[PDB]
Symmetry: C4
């Protein structure tokens, strides 16, 4: 159930959440990359979504490799080793 | 018309509806599974969507195998033996 | 550009518009069928979307084979002989 | 990541933005065509989205071959030589 690559063309943290579902039996090793209008992309931000669980990820909580600056439009690519379902809220 | 597997990565019942269309000539035997961030999934919740009809299903009305707790973020996978069209409202 | 079959699982006329784009060089002969929770589907409602034009269709304006009753949830299937792009507003 | 052809069946400038992401390593040479209910399409409007960057394009800022009239419903087709991701805001 789902796909191993998702993209979100607009993101913004005011001066921002992806709901992920891994309905499968293997843990999802997820890698997020943040894109900008005027600089190189930052990432991967790495996290695990456990087998048969949801996980909400707040863009504001991401910090490794670096925090996402606030008041800045960005886009994001989310890649997983196993199919997941992503909804941007 | 439609697909036999649909996923909804974010659901919530405040302390929540899927509109299903079976445009086909066979009844749809539908199975919903609810996923959580911190426990195993619950289901299948089973229902029939008749040939050439819509059916609205309220998540709050589901009760077999168990009611969905309120004030709790969940996701859902909806599977059918025949193609259906699902919209989350 | 687009597809020849589109479905909209929830529609409602209070007691409702599809924006269609035919980016192609042939006229689109479109057929809409309305589905209900408790009776057989009604249609086809037939219309033409000209080559390289948009057309907005209000569900409230449809009348042949019959008007859609108000205050009634419905779904719709839109079929075309040529690819079109449909957005429900 | 993404597709080389995107369509947006409803656009309107009051008397309107596409967020584009090129997550790839080649620049995206993008061509927008505007469609109307009652006249021939206008375009291509041409722009470049750089490798590994986002770009927001305001429909109100487009002017070559011609400005889009205000208070007028339109649709748009966006074509690229390389896959991009488009979100209409």
């Amino acid at each position: 159930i789902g796909r191993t690559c998702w993209a979100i063309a607009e993101g913004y943290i005011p001066p921002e959440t992806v709901c992920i579902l891994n309905a499968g039996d293997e843990d999802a090793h997820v890698e997020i990359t943040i894109y900008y209008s005027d600089k190189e992309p930052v990432g991967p931000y790495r996290l695990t979504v456990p087998a048969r669980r949801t996980k909400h990820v707040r863009f504001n909580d991401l910090n490794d490799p670096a925090p996402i600056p606030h008041d800045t439009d960005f886009a994001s690519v989310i890649q997983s080793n196993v199919p997941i379902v992503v909804q941007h809220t």
